Structure formats: structure tokens, C-alpha cells
Amino acid sequence: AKWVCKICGYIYDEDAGDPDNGISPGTKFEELPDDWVCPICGAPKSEFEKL
């Protein structure tokens, strides 16, 4: 799945993960740490919408 940061437009792609911030590819959004935030704008998970 992809999820979009409603603040900045960043797309969290679960296939890509977010390895620079400790997230391996294939990590589902729901598996992201509570303290993970948009690596662009720092918005919390609450500001993401699933596409």
C-alpha cells in the first residue's frame, strides 16, 4: 500500500519502507513505530491517508 502525508505530499510506500529512518522495505504502515513521522515534514502517523 501507499500512504500519503496529507501535510506535505510525501508518499510512504510500504514496498520501499523508509530505511534511512530504520524501516525496512515491506513494512506496513500499521507496523511503523508509534514514534515514526513523515521523514519530510515530521507529521505524525495520524496525518497519513491510505491511497
Ligand SMILES: [Fe+3]
Ligand atoms: Fe509530510
